[model samples]
Target chain A: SLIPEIDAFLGCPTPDAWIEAALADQETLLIDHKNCEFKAASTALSLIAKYNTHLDLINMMSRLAREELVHHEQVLRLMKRRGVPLRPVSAGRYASGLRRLVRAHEPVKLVDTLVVGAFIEARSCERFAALVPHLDEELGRFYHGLLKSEARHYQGYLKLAHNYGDEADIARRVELVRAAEMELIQSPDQELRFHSGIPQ
Target chain B: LIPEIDAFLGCPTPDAWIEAALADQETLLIDHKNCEFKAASTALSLIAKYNTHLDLINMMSRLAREELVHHEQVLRLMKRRGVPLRPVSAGRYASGLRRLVRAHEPVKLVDTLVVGAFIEARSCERFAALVPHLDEELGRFYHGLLKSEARHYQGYLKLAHNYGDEADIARRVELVRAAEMELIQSPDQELRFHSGIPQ
Candidate 1:
């Protein structure tokens, strides 16, 4: 129900199977969620480092990076209180699949990357909203708090994509990237991650 | 304006290092961007480790945000000047200071925060020193950064004091300050945002 814009923007809902898998292992879910937050921060910082020129991109990504780090800190607090060991977990295929579509050229590479970022943020928000009903009061509230920022992040990334590249190219690339994200989410996945597809 | 930082550091950015920075302005911007990222990274890592301490969490979250914004500003400067963001190995400055931190809690946190304070103080000091020597825009930009850097140094020290006894914090501050001065005053092979005198 939250961020109806994100619901419309994303290709499909986070599958029921994935939600069932997430509810089964809250420890692994929190760990993967914390990892996703850290990765989000890193990705934003990298964009600032590599792109460096676009003011809109810099401002948006700077705020996004900071917010992501705060989320990371919050999740770590949750994990600490919950006694979830903060160990390493390997990433799933969703991110890499989207990343693979980022073109090798200049503005195109930048544009595609932004689109990918948007979808990632959008999906994270969608998944959070999806899980809110099934989670405990504490976790439900935490995930609920994240929806506003995640929605803004996805929208910000989408705006940056439009700002930096051609409309036709961006539209075409968005569809391509959108389709890739849908496939990654809709397909059955062996490993469970924060951004994983339908659980096998 | 940064007299506190200058006094905290107890040593200025050496003229030789400033000259080195002037000679290789490209490296300066590149390494400066690197420093911002590292600063933010350190803040996040600290938050992860010290999650229960509300003061630490709040300060570090704000600090990391500020550092990334600073990174964006420097990167914009880099873009304008056409300075490619090339890879550069980290300087020995921070690790050298951090090596003195004790391997225990509270004290460990105290020492770590002290190290952070010194790093920020030195950054503020150096930004002030380089302002007069840099080009007009950069001179203004570096000068502009002084205010935040000064506050960052104070914030770190404040948190350090909050989590430790005054006497212990005082001793640790002195201990770390000695190492920080040594890092600044000694000669070094490479130039960085926080490096010693160039070889």
Candidate 2:
């Protein structure tokens, strides 16, 4: 059964196979999770800088950025605790996949970009919710802790997208982008990432 | 006499200038403590969005933590004195500086770096200038922040210096720099940390 809210806004939850694979590559998983927070923060911040409008969204996103950055450090703390070295990991096709689909004009670009952010964040929330049960007590709890913020981020992105224009249209685009994301999700990735598809 | 800090700042704040700040002690701390967190938010946003560069992210993370910590210290003191924490109205100072940022990427990134440098640099100069004017309480608190302010400003400057064309950054820096100077020097209807000549 689909999650009424998540499936409405995002794709289906992470499959059991994906969960098993995620746990199999725990170290890489943590690394990607850590990077995702920074990446999320960066997305919001860049939008704030570029748009220069949307005072409310800028404020919301800026706070989200701070929480996410601090969250990044916490993930690093766990990585250190577990002996995982913090190295740069190039972003996966997930973000780029959705980004490429965004409209390339003003305000619409920003709005579509924000909508793309919502899809990614909503997926994070969905995936984290699915992955938490399979993780260890501490890691499970951590992923669970991440859910509230992710949910808020997902909603913020959605609201801003709606605020920028017609929701019916944005939701349609979300469908398109979500399908784009699913393509990446179904395809196998050599490097397992926070948003990576089926692991090779 | 010019303080050692004048060497670091784009402009010097004279004794009278610092004395004028004493004209409204309550709001200055409120403005400052609030701005510290805002500064952190700014850096974090830069880290969150435009900068994936490790060194810059590291610097921003550090800056964000330090700002919140300083804010915590200031807030505690304010609370001890039973100073009510009032709600924040966005200041004109930051938006004024940011208005100069070019409306695009990489170029916007450069201007953002320059904006950050001026922010940190302005704080260092303002904090240094205000130190002598305060009494026993805030005076020492302000004293404790100087080294951090200098380092914070220096780090922002260092990052801006490394990121791209210096001439472009400096050229933009001068633009925002002039605006910032005007904010401090000219009279304004609103009063805030860097509010144009205080009401």
Candidate 3:
């Protein structure tokens, strides 16, 4: 199937263990998928309202909002196709980890949120890369196709982060989150959804 | 040819007063365009280099760089075409509103930046809408622009959030939307691509 091609591109198959874990936790995966899209939409709207003065910023936010909403619709369609009901799941450890670092101040809070957004897009791209290798033909192709846009989304978040913060602050915060992301990706977790790392 | 259609669509003739102003401040606009593209690429490159997870940054940075290079190329093209690189007068379109920018405070800075993103996005959308009716080369160029322009819009919003504190982004968005609508709907003497309603 398309899995082989995507695996070749990404340089790794879905770890044998991840596939088995995903099968066992299909419900959780579906739930997280919905939540991820929702979070993306929220972030887009918030950014548009907060930073509307800059022409470029407005352009990006409006389009990003439209795209994220489209993604949310895609996830919802996927869940429906799979016969997975949309039920609320508790927020995953992924977002909370990033949120813990958010400053209580105004723009700093904004900056931190953007940093967190970078992580989300980064993680999504990584997860998509990982999943593309193991899924069936149709799914693999779809996942692979999403890689370009997802990667751009992550880049968008990082650029905003740099533009908004002082150089030192931006560097320090980015490094801090990069570490956090690595830990999140490498850590052992009971849940094995898209963003979850190695299963324990 | 379609003067009424152009007017209805808020089109400004490049040969009109707006072009005259742009001719006066040629370097300034070129510089602004160059700086804008530079910021776009810098942001994309940073994400690509440091975050191995996202590969789109490489593509985006490459695209943005090429775009700026092309903008410079266009300047050269304009020169080659004997489109004299004249200094056009500055319009109050952008600056008139920038006067509202609050000094100090990161959140306010972010709000202003977000406003900037929306304007860029609107410009891109407008350009896309205009592309099909242009000449072949120009149409192709604008068509090529849709993807990066779309992504750039996203990039600006991403930064806006990175800089904002509360969810107060919506109110600001509304304010900008009103401002933008006014800019687009109002009459103006300048007639650049992004210029608002023509007088």
Candidate 4:
């Protein structure tokens, strides 16, 4: 199975406890998931706004954003069907922790930025896979359909990350960010969210 | 009859601005419609990461739909005018406030909500301010938008007040208002939906 390499490349799996908690509170799951898609698009928009000079990132992020928003719309539809409401949520440490690792330079900053996005998108792809079988047939099947496109997102980011540095640099940075990503995923989180800590 | 929108904004929307805006209807309409889309997306973005306390989901849901409607309504105007809405760069006025956002959890929530207040407050104020300046249909349209936007500003306050200590948040709001006015008052050639800086 691809699970081991993917897990090693990314981080830990979504614990069984998280799956139980998500099923227990479908509201947060759907709501946070919906939010995540929008945030994904937003992350793309910021990247575009800052660095369209790198036309690949410009095209890549713009396309990724469009796809993310498409998923956001679908999530909204799913939420309405399930009678889940949309509201504000405090953020998890995953993205921010990775942000703290971003270097303070030009090409390096841009490269690390791509690395952070890839980690996040990859983790999202991974979590969705983890969540598929545990969900009801409709959602299970629905999430299954999204996996391929999301895999492309991670690939896109990885490709973009290498535009500035060698394979060794990219892999080395990924390991550093993965350390933070794993901590954020593994730590106790305050709120119920799509990428939250194990239930307290 | 609430002509006193000046009180709501950090500073008054100048008579010269209304004149300049009226002269540049093309830019004004494009900017205004884009503002609605930005606000709607912003509301949607807020929900993606934050907790839904104070029945925030209900409020955000309605706010998102409402702004979306206004977004379309503004787009509908472009249908008659035959101009495409283009993305404009951020002026220092709002960008400066974004810098003030503390990167913590609920703190980010409160700061962004306060920033939302400024956007909505400015939107409401401009809607009211523009009423008398525009043609009858456009003026009445602007007038009709006032109530809901006023509610948006007020709603932001309620949401912000709940997220943290009122006084601490009050200082933050003041900081935002202060940062906003710094560039807002700066004389520049750039004209945006908010502030006098044009780039």
Candidate 5:
């Protein structure tokens, strides 16, 4: 219910198969999820530092980074409470798949990166919504609680993208990122990461 | 190992603050964690406000990531020791330094970077000061962090030079260092990771 906009933005829903895999391997699920939270905060900080000249970008990304850090702390504490010690996990290909679409030139590079951020946030919002129902009460409630903030984060990225580039350019890049994101989501993935495609 | 940082800082953390930290290890760890978060945010702000400087952008990007990793490490340690994360008010130490920053471009950036250098240098120095006294685990953790913290101050100082004339930068650095020294030596009622003597 929280994902109607995200569901529309994303090319596909998280497959039932992926959810089943996540349930079967809760350890991997939560570990990868926690990693995503840290990475999310890092990514937002990188953007803020790289694009600090943009006032709106600075404001949005600053708040977004703080939120991601809070979420990261929350998950770390939660994992500790659940007796889940931190473990190393390699990243999935989803980010690189979208990264491939970013142009190397200015304005366009910024635009493409912002568009990619939008897609990434949107897809994360979608996945969180999809998994909330199947998770335990604590995690379900947590994931559900996250939907609102994630949704706002997604929209903020999209709005920033529009602010930085021409509407035509923004529209084209959005389509390009959305297509790549859709492919990443629908294709089979080697691991069941928080942002991975359907598991192989 | 960190002669440069100590020289740049112009003073060591006061013994009074270190003693205060030891007496309240809980507040120390919690405030340390908070400092890590703010450090990352500060790095990001530098990046955002000075995007044209690729050197600064690159350095700050790495610094922010490193700070977050430390934040997580401290969080883990706190969890193991059963220290809950709670809100604490910001002590006047940071703001006291910020009050000296100039209000224009180039100068503003230079002053900000100098302030950053003071902060990183002080943190490195304090960590070194505490290493021999803390329990093995906490001591080792603090010890492990000393080198990078030293480098962070160096990076900030180097960037400050890059943006301003060395002579000008030196004067600015001295200005900030004087304030930083006073902050460390004066009396502060709040015990923080960077507070002065407890009042």
Candidate 6:
């Protein structure tokens, strides 16, 4: 089964050394799939409620929000299966790095949020791709199933970035975040979270 | 053969109407050929620049941008062709469907968004269908558009998931799908880029 494949690839019990690293202070590998779900829901609602003027943008955010919640459900199911209880875990540095860049005004706020969204999607895709090779078959298949949608999510966010801002500003901001993202991934990080930088 | 075909195809030069429309600062509409070309380019750029999960936000952005650009490009082409830039009356097709948008909260929002995706997907499908009927330049352009439009459809679906819970999302999708079918099947005004079944 796909699950066994994923389990084998991740090497069942998820190496104590890696788990220790993940759970270590500043390492925070545990993701509250529940929180992640809430975040996704919030992000979608916020975008729609705020940017309802643009019909297309509203539509895109609305649909995306639904998908994220579904993903949260999937993750929860996985946790349940593994006997891992949902618990509060410190989020790693990835989202904060992206969030810091969000602008403070209308439309522009929408634009920055969208840009951050793009990064999240890109990181999701990157991480999914990265883990597929290491995860057991079931998990591997699940991740793979997610790849196409994740890639689409990345595009959706970038499109919003382009649509909502001045072209020059949007381009510059994208480059800025792209570089920040590269740094986040390249630098030594203490965590082994889903979106944390490369393993220390 | 070329002149003969031109003569046969050409209607009266609507130069005065064109001049008037341009004077009115109307949004430009180009020929079918150019629209297809721009759509193809926009689709490629979108796919290459943004991947799957990111597709919805970015593609929505791009779709809006590209559609506007195409509108501009078509206007320019019409000018070059000496075709008038009249405010071609938009048929009730899209708006009619939009009228069905419920007054509720997220469901209303979700339904409308799904409708937008369906509109784009239909356009993409039409372009593909039209490719074989068009001249060489246009054919190549439509062929290139297939993947991006397909990706856009997927992006919309993903966003729908991201925005709402499962049952709500599914219900919204069904609502819009029906509307889309109606628009596609209904009789319509003279065929334009996004026109429905010919009236």
Per-residue C-alpha lDDT of model 6 across residues A1-200, encoded as one tens digit per residue: 11112222221122334334433432123244344543665566556445434556755655675566566556555655666544446667878888898778776777777777877766666556655675668767877977778777877777767766787777667667777766776666665666656466
Residue A130 Cα positional deviation in candidate 1, in Å, after optimal superposition: 1.8
RMSD of each predicted structure: 6.0, 8.6, 13.8, 8.8, 15.8, 15.0
Give the TM-scores of the predictions, in the order they appear: 0.69, 0.62, 0.45, 0.55, 0.56, 0.43
Q: Candidate 1 — which pairs collide?
A: none
Please, what are the lDDT tens digits per residue for candidate 3 over residues A83-168? 77655465567777777888889767777778778777766776777666667786577568667777788778778777777767
**Candidate 1: where is the Cα deviation over 4 Å?**
A1-4, A81-83, B1-11, B15-34, B41-62, B69-118, B127-199
**Candidate 2: deviation at residue A71, Å?**
1.1
For residue B159, model 5's alpha carbon misses the true position, in angstroms, by 1.2
Per-residue lDDT of model 2, residues A117-173, tens digit only: 888888898888888777789888888988888887777778777777766677677
Q: Could you tell me which 10 consecutive residues in candidate 5 chain B have the lowest summed lDDT?
A: B47-56
Q: What is the DockQ of candidate 2?
A: 0.12
TM-score, cand. 2 vs. native: 0.62
A35-79 per-residue lDDT for model 1 (tens digits): 788778878777866865555676677778878878877987888
The alpha-carbon deviation from the true structure for residue A90 of candidate 6, after best TM-score superposition, in angstroms, is 2.2
Which of 1 and 6 is the better model by DockQ? 1
A143, model 5: CA deviation in Å? 27
**Model 3 over residues B5-118: C-alpha lDDT tens digits?**
122222333334333433544443443343344344343434323322123323333434444444444454445445543434445555555665566665555665555565
lDDT of 5: 0.79
Q: Rank the candidates by TM-score, best first.
A: 1, 2, 5, 4, 3, 6
Of 1 and 3, which scores higher on lDDT? 1
**lDDT, candidates in the order shown:** 0.83, 0.72, 0.57, 0.72, 0.79, 0.54
Candidate structures ordered by DockQ, highest first: 1, 2, 4, 5, 3, 6
Clashes of each: 0, 3, 47, 14, 1, 60
The candidate maximizing lDDT is 1
